[PDB]
Amino acid sequence: TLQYTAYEKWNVITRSARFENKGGERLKLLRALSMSVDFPTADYDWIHLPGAWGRERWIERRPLVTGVQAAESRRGASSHQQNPFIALVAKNADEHQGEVYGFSFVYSGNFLAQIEVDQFGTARVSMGINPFDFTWLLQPGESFQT
Amino acid sequence: KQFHLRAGKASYVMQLFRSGYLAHVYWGKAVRDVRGARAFPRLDRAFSPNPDPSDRTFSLDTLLQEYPAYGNTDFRAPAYQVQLENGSTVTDLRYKTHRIYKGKPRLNGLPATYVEHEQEAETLEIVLGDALIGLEVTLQYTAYEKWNVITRSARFENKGGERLKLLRALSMSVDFPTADYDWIHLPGAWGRERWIERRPLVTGVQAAESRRGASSHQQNPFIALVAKNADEHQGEVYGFSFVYSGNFLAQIEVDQFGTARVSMGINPFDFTWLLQPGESFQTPEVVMVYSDQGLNGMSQTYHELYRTRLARGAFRDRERPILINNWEATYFDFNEEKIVNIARTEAELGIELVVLDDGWFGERDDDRRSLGDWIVNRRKLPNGLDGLAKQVNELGLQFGLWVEPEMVSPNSELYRKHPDWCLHVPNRPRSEGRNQLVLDYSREDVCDYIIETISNVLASAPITYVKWDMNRHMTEIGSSALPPERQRETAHRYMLGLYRVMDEITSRLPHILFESCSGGGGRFDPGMLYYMPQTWTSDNTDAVSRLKIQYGTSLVYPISAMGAHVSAVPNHQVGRVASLKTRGHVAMSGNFGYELDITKLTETEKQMMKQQVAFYKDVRRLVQFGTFYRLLSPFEGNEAAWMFVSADRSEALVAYFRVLAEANAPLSYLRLKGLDSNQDYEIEGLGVYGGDELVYAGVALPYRSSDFISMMWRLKAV
Amino acid sequence: KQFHLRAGKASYVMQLFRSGYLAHVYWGKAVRDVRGARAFPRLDRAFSPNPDPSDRTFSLDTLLQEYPAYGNTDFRAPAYQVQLENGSTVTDLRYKTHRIYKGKPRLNGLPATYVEHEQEAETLEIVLGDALIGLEVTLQYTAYEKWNVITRSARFENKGGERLKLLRALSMSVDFPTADYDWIHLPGAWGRERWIERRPLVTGVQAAESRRGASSHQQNPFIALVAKNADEHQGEVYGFSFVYSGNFLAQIEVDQFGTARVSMGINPFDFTWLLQPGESFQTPEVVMVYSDQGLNGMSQTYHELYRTRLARGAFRDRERPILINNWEATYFDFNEEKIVNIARTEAELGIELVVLDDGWFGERDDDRRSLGDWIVNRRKLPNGLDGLAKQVNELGLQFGLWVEPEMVSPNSELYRKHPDWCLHVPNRPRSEGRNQLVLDYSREDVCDYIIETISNVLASAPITYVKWDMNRHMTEIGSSALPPERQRETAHRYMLGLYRVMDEITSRLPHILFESCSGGGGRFDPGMLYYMPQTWTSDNTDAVSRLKIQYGTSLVYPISAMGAHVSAVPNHQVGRVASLKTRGHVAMSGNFGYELDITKLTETEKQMMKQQVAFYKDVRRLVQFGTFYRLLSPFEGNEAAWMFVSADRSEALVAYFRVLAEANAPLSYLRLKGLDSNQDYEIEGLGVYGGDELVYAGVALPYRSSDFISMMWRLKAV
Amino acid sequence: RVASLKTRGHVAMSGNFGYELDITKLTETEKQMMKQQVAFYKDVRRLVQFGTFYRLLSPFEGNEAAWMFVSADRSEALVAYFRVLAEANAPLSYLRLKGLDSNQDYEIEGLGVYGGDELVYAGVALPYRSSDFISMMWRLKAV
Secondary structure (H helix, E strand, C coil): CEEEEECCCCCCEEEEEEEECCCCCCEEECCCEEEEEEECCCCCEEEEEECECCECCCCEEEECCCCEEEEEECCCCCCCCEEEEEEEECCCCCCCCCCEEEEECCCCCCEEEEEEECCCCCEEEEEECCCCCCCEEECCCCEEEC | CEEEEEECCEEEEEEEECCCEEEEEEEEECCCCCCCCCCCCCCCCCCCCECCCCCCCCCHHHCCECCCCCCCCCCCCCCEEEECCCCCCCCCCEEEEEEEEECCCCECCECCCCCCCHHHEEEEEEEEEECCCCEEEEEEEEEECCCCEEEEEEEEEECCCCCEEEEEEEEEEEEECCCCCEEEEEECECCECCCCEEEECCCCEEEEEECCCCCCCCEEEEEEEECCCCCCCCECEEEEEECCCCCEEEEEEECCCCCEEEEEECCCCCCCEEECCCCEEECCCEEEEEECECHHHHHHHHHHHHHHHCCCCCCCCCCCCCEEECHHHHCCCCCHHHHHHHHHHHHHHCCCEEEECCCCECCCCCCCCCCCCCCECCCCCCCHHHHHHHHHHCCCCEEEEEECCCEECCCCHHHHHCCCCECCCCCCCCCEECCEEEECCCCHHHHHHHHHHHHHHHHCCCCCEEEECCCCCCCCCCCCCCCHHHHHHHHHHHHHHHHHHHHHHHHHCCCCEEEECECEECCCCHHHHCCCCEEECECCCCHHHHHHHHHHHCCCCCHHHEEEEEECCCCCCCCCCCCHHHHHHHHCCCEEEEECCHHHCCHHHHHHHHHHHHHHHHHHHHHHHCEEEEEECCCCCCEEEEEEECCCCCEEEEEEEECCCCCCCCCEEECCCCCCCCCEEEECCCEEEEHHHHHHCCEEECCCCCCCEEEEEEEEEC | CEEEEEECCEEEEEEEECCCEEEEEEEEECCCCCHHHCCCCCCCCCCCCECCCCCCCCCHHHCCECCCCCCCCCCCCCCEEEECCCCCCCCCCEEEEEEEEECCCCCCCCCCCCCCCHHHEEEEEEEEEECCCCEEEEEEEEEECCCCEEEEEEEEEECCCCCEEEEEEEEEEEEECCCCCEEEEEECECCECCCCEEEECCCCEEEEEECCCCCCCCEEEEEEEECCCCCCCCECEEEEEECCCCCEEEEEEECCCCCEEEEEECCCCCCCEEECCCCEEECCCEEEEEECEHHHHHHHHHHHHHHHHCCCCCCCCCCCCCEEECHHHHCCCCCHHHHHHHHHHHHHHCCCEEEECCCCECCCCCCCCCCCCCCECCCCCCCHHHHHHHHHHCCCCEEEEEECCCEECCCCHHHHHCHHHECCCCCCCCCECCCCEEECCCCHHHHHHHHHHHHHHHHCCCCCEEEECCCCCCCCCCCCCCCHHHHHHHHHHHHHHHHHHHHHHHHHCCCCEEEECECEECCCCHHHHCCCCEEECECCCCCCHHHHHHHHHCCCCCHHHEEEEEECCCCCCCCCCCCHHHHHHHHCCCEEEEECCHHHCCHHHHHHHHHHHHHHHHHHHHHHHCEEEEEECCCCCCEEEEEEECCCCCEEEEEEEECCCCCCCCCCEECCCCCCCCCEEEECCCEEEEHHHHHHHCEECCCCCCCCEEEEEEEEEC | CCCCHHHHHHHHCCCCCCCCCCHHHCCHHHHHHHHHHHHHHHHHHHHHHHCEEEEEECCCCCCEEEEEEECCCCCEEEEEEEECCCCCCCCCCEECCCCCCCCCEEEECCCEEEEHHHHHHCCEECCCCCCCCEEEEEEEEEC
């Protein structure tokens, strides 16, 4: 079940998914991201928040690449090193004008925030619990909420 | 003490400082008031000398100015410079008086933006003066009501009893407090005029200029300071447009303290002007435009102002005729029988105007003779211009004529009779471009002769269209009718003559639509637009080449004046093969016309042409008089896109272009501008879309192959 | 008819084209032959007019030239321009003859790079000429055998019978076939001179220039064409250094056809020069360096050339004394005892020179008076300069003196006696800077006076060091001893006079080390370097600020001439607190010295000074005369690093700087240059590293917290 | 790094304000400075912690950093400006604001009354200052 919520007051769209095993066999979640969205074009810059202890959340803006880009955490915590937030930014956009698409993860553990540009210039922004070192077993009757 | 000009949604503020000094403070979006109470004290800047020895905090080197001079403690490039009889170049202009009156004054012997009603603008005249030498300088400011336009010019007058030589006389100068801008000018050449060149500013001097006696293909008299993030659709832009068609200097200087001095006017290089007691000198005007709407906002401001308040004549607000020029069909070799029976087919295709090009006069079989001898060749036109024009008229077409009045061929009746009438210098060889010389328009006799000769030729037949051409640039600049101390005034006096010549000629013939031309857009400037309501954009007629040229031309000049014609293939300039459908769409994006041999066209092509002609007539008033938006830039990529929107936004026309085809290409999309978001639009042949969707989301573009493709969409509000 | 200059590993090729025209062909890496200055189909370019009317392909507008003019079909900015009596500015120089001789000539009344032997260089003089007006221009080319150096200058001579007036007379002009380069110039201000500014070329005009009568803090007389991918260590770089200390114009012009014109010389603005029949005019020279080995390679060429073949005197090849200036100690209020007392303390620390600053002359107690009156104040110095110097000498210290001979205070005996001896113009207010006026060095009486006055004073005491200073820029430029027609020659004539003053004064006192100064490095140019072998780099003595300042200055001028003094904190210019350790390391990267109140220093600080002085004495020869490589640029990041390597590469000194501290910072590394890869070097205190490892792999940097850090390593071959 | 107590306060007041220093080791001036700081923050606390935030100048893009807080009705504002590395003989500085009501006038405390549109479209001149790591804080109230 895909969960969409749209606030009336803000330009906020929240997304999450709920897995349920209604069958008779074990289903093993190798990957269970909260969301994924395919942009029709890929002419963008992206912004994530890299850093370290004593210097968290430095704004880093980079052009997109044909391939994969990702800020992630494998530390069991959201981390000083990469904050669970990425943003698609228009080429000419700044602090005061321009189109911006922010992605914020409401979770304090391992995360993956990825942007993939394919052969046809489409951009897939996917975000959620880091698939790395992660599985989740669903017995019949069990559920998983991202 | 404080002057506050309010033009449209913009503000231009100045303030009188201490005793007579005029300081610049602010220019940008309109504010109610700029607080006069200055925030923090001035500084004692090292090596910035002081006019007042007691106060080291004051220095003209560190004062934002309106019309600065050099040698008085300011070390930056001045707006003007005057040499006295004693050899010094030091002058000191102080405030005398100032006046404010509704409307806009005319400029003496010079073209200028105008108003038709007093309510349309306010004019501020600040009278400055140097009492010692008796030099008076009046700074002229005009602020329009409906536009963000501030026009600036200067007026010198010698009230002293000495000779005053103007070494430099720019129209304007302005000091920005900060220098964090990029700058855009329009460099180019013949075949590729007005390419948009965006560059970061350097700490020093950058300048676009012309030393050719004409505004030139090489540099268009327009520069602009633009914000670092400003684009076509947003950001702050500061336009500077010179209303003049001769030599010019458009300069930006960034100094040690991060200020940017923008100056514009008649190129000081190889230029002087002598002022005897009682004599005056009026500078051409510079049209300054602000916009936080981006580049399109600036251009649209220029478009309305230039089309409705710079262009003149009966054809100013009128739809321009779809013409055809028969240059490739006949060349210098033509006759009456050949033109009229060809013009009969052209009339049936829908053409509204047939233009007779070069070769109708004197001994014209070459481009190496006969310029200056403007009499009908009875050998080619036995019944003359009168006979040809009337025979053309009864087929239902207007008749046009090509002229090049500013030129004289060494092999001509005129030159053999008046060899001293050309621009020349004593005992030097007379250089030739295209085997021709330049006539001396600094002289009254030469001008008077041309006015009479050309007007009589133009009155001898029902000619309603004129292509005024110039195909050379000035060399050996001098006059045999000028004293040695006024020889450097020749270039400007020439332009004054030409302006006066055109002014009288166009006045004698109010029934004629005039189109200026100079080897293409050699003189596509505001100055020429005042006399001739349209211009030949470029000799290059390639559809793909025209993408850059027209895109860059539209930056300042209205589409109504931007001439664009469909030509033959393979192209004569580059050898490129584009589709007839593509060449039409590019040409229909400007002042539509034709330049090709219709007899060489296949039967299928003639039908394309008939549909092109019929289609343009439907979209003409929208194209030529509508609001213009640049969507995709050919300078920034493989695509070119723009659109025209009606005043009430109920109608729109979209043009898209893609040069080099990509195999297995990504899907194409196009977002539009200037539509009513609260209203729905029907795209002919596609369906109905919301205005908000087209602008915010965009339209999926059709997947197409082959190089040099084009697409046109008529948009209609439901 | 081809001229082929061979300088080091570089080639400069020219050619005689058609009827006496001189055409540029190639400049870059050395070639045995240029076969291809012969066969090339020339194009008929639109609007490029023709000297020979029947050939439309040939135009001066489209010809790469060496000394071009305007009005002869060339529309680009010319190298020269001269107005005739009839008013015209048209001139036509044709090839006359040429001569080749080994060695390099001296420029009349001007400084110039020289040779000690004929074998060091070869000189090509190309004599052009305009037969009509009798104008003869001789183009001077010199190619050094040992370096990639080509020097260019021009000599005008009126061999006709009319007056020739030079509107423009640049030292050189060169037309590159392409324009795909970036360009580097050195802008700045007082307290921040010569910041490196890299910019892409624009299609139009870019320039660095000075209208201040001095080379200026604002713009240094140096520009450079660099390849797009060129950096400090590799790539093609073309340097243009002007040997002149006054007004200049350094300009690059890119035309419609993608050619880049680099021209340099005396600024045409506010400049003329009258040439009566029989008179001649010599332009200063421009030193051109080619390098395929990066910015370092270009700079290194200049370093050797300027240190060994431009700088003169007994101190040219000599180690410079470590000096102390006690200006901050006493200001204007001092006496003989107070100076000698502090001299003992400084002498104990190891300092070698004590310099007496401003306030020793006349009634100089402020900065509002006494300039021009060079007589010992008997209140402060009862025993005169001789008595003070003698005492200082037997303390073991050399003695130095501060002078500002070009300046006159309105409140001085000199000015109330000779009010016409200052630069001024009739009936205009005499503007001041730092409450002082500029003496008229265009006049003979003034120069001879200064020459006698300063010489006798400098010979009256065992003075072995002089600091020559100027703290003002020209306003109201003019001379009472000049006719109106020669008034605009004043600035250049001033500079010619100054050059003669310095030449005669320095010649009288061969045992005196002269250091040029101008509110810091306001006159840090090759012209001054010819008369005074070292220069005060900047009044900004802040360690961090000096990173950029010394980095940019090092781009052209040798380390031996770059004065750098350790000062007190909080820094008087920026207010920054940097460690004495860091202030030392920065100052030790140049001509080391001190400028601070020793009486205000802590005992810990004074001990660091002794260690400092001892250290620099070990590395002095290596620093001042060694090879200089820049590693990390402060203009490009948070770091600054460079190193000095001996000729035999057996010894090296490495300097590193970080300015802003970073918490939990990444591990730092540093890679070196110029070492012998096949040799092992011991880094003192660290260990032994291989030269290849040092250059290819690099060294690990220590982890340091705290702001503004510095580090020095001594390298020695095993 | 050594920065002025004034500067350390202006940065800390830009967020959730607190103290992390030994008072037993403070001079009388510093303790009196702290008291002045606390009294100031309590005045703009509701504005800082609950007002609208505008970033003006990025410390990631240059030598400056600036941001401002604007109240809901735009009748009140706090402007914070920071400059790290001192430049000798530096150019004149200016600051443009955001989120103000163009139709209203604002009193910048201790400076005078400026128009809202002026502060946003023209900008206000900044004081010439030396020393490293400086800060400036302005309170704005509508008339």
